[PDB]
Structure 1
Amino acid sequence: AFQPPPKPVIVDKRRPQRPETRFLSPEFIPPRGRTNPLKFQIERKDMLERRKILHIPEFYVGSILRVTTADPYASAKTSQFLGICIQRSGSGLGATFILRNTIEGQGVEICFELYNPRIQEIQVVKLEKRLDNSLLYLRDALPEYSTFDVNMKPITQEFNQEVPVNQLKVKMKPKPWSKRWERPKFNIKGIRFDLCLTEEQMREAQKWSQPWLEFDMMREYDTSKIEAAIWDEIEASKNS
């Protein structure tokens, strides 16, 4: 029997210079409330101890994941679900992410909890960013943007692609939608408005714009030192 040779990497730091950037999952960022930081420290220790067993990978809103959950009433004790990440929300041990997929013409959304012990394995089959941090408009979008092959193979990516952002404009179903995605409070760039809405509709939707919120300077949440401390704790836990 013969085995073929592996393909090693030919990184040459000489001609191309490429550094490396840190990625902190959104669940570690504490909310803006006046909660005692001791609770956040306790929750961070708990979620790090949980991550020591369950490998929670890096994935953004728009990536396609496959989650294996422990189901007692199924044929096999495991149940797989593949879908695109609609949104990631929550802080600490209760962080959740929404997976959406069209199965036989019926669109299904499941809100999985990251640190639930019933989750066996999470697999990012396509690490991929999109034009919006929350693409909840896929409910009102055409079904083709929600259908994904449940048996699709994982796509492996190399580090030097820095999470390619998918600039995909999405077609829309006729009005009305689940929400008024044309309002400035959503700030949506992933919907092809020029083919579904009209000029007067856009002008009427622009009446709800608040241009002072981007220059308020007091509604911003600066978490530089918080993120630095969280990263220090993460490195300490990884070394321990």
Structure 2
Amino acid sequence: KTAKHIMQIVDKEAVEEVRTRREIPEIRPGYIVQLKVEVPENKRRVSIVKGIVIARRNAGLNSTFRIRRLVAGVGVESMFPLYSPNLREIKVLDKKRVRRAKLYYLRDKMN
């Protein structure tokens, strides 16, 4: 119990450390977000990524979210850690009305 309590304390402090240096907006399923992603594998190449949030998981500093988009006609799904330092900027562009927390039916959608 004390071990898990220590993990929770350290995670809470780590999350509050990040949120006082960078601005991270609230991200929900169905949100159209645009973000700039630095990929350190590809010589730290920065690209702009835009898509609809289809999934989210709240796990403290290791919270994740998933983005579905079309790139040159091919559907590309990307999962990002929310507090990753390689996300330079996150903007929320639009909010679609959805009824659920996971939108995996969008993969079977024609568009």
**Which range, TM-score by smaller chain?**
0.7 to 0.9
- The offset of 1:136, in angstroms, is 1.0
Secondary structure in structure 2 of the residue aligned to 1:42: helix
Structure-1 residue corresponding to 2:39 = 71
Letter in 1 for 2:27: F
Secondary structure in structure 2 of the residue aligned to 1:132: coil
Structure-2 residue corresponding to 1:61 = 29
- The offset of 1:141, in angstroms, is 1.2
Over residues 59-105 of structure 1, what are the superposed CA-to-partner deviations in whole Å (9 max), with x where a residue is unaligned? 2101011121113536x842110000010024111111000001222
Partner Cα separation in structure 2 for residue 36 and residue 87 of structure 1: 26
- The offset of 1:34, in angstroms, is 9.3
Letter in 2 for 1:36: K
- The offset of 1:132, in angstroms, is 1.1
Structure-2 residue corresponding to 1:223 = none
Over residues 90-146 of structure 1, what are the superposed CA-to-partner deviations in whole Å (9 max), with x where a residue is unaligned? 411111100000122200000011111111011111134411111111111122xxx
Partner Cα separation in structure 1 for residue 72 and residue 47 of structure 2: 18
Is residue 81 from structure 1 mapped to residue 49 from structure 2 by the alignment?
Answer: yes
Q: TM-score, normalised by structure 1?
A: 0.42
Partner Cα separation in structure 2 for residue 139 and residue 69 of structure 1: 23
Partner Cα separation in structure 1 for residue 34 and residue 9 of structure 2: 30
Tell me if the contact between 1:61 and 1:129 (Cα under 8 Å) persists in the aligned partners: no
Structure-1 residue corresponding to 2:103 = 135
From 82, 86, 89, the counterpart of 1:118: 86
- State the Cα RMSD in Å: 2.2
How many equivalent pairs are there? 110
Higher strand share: 2
Letter in 1 for 2:68: R
Q: Which has the larger radius of gyration?
A: 1
Tell me if the contact between 1:60 and 1:129 (Cα under 8 Å) persists in the aligned partners: no
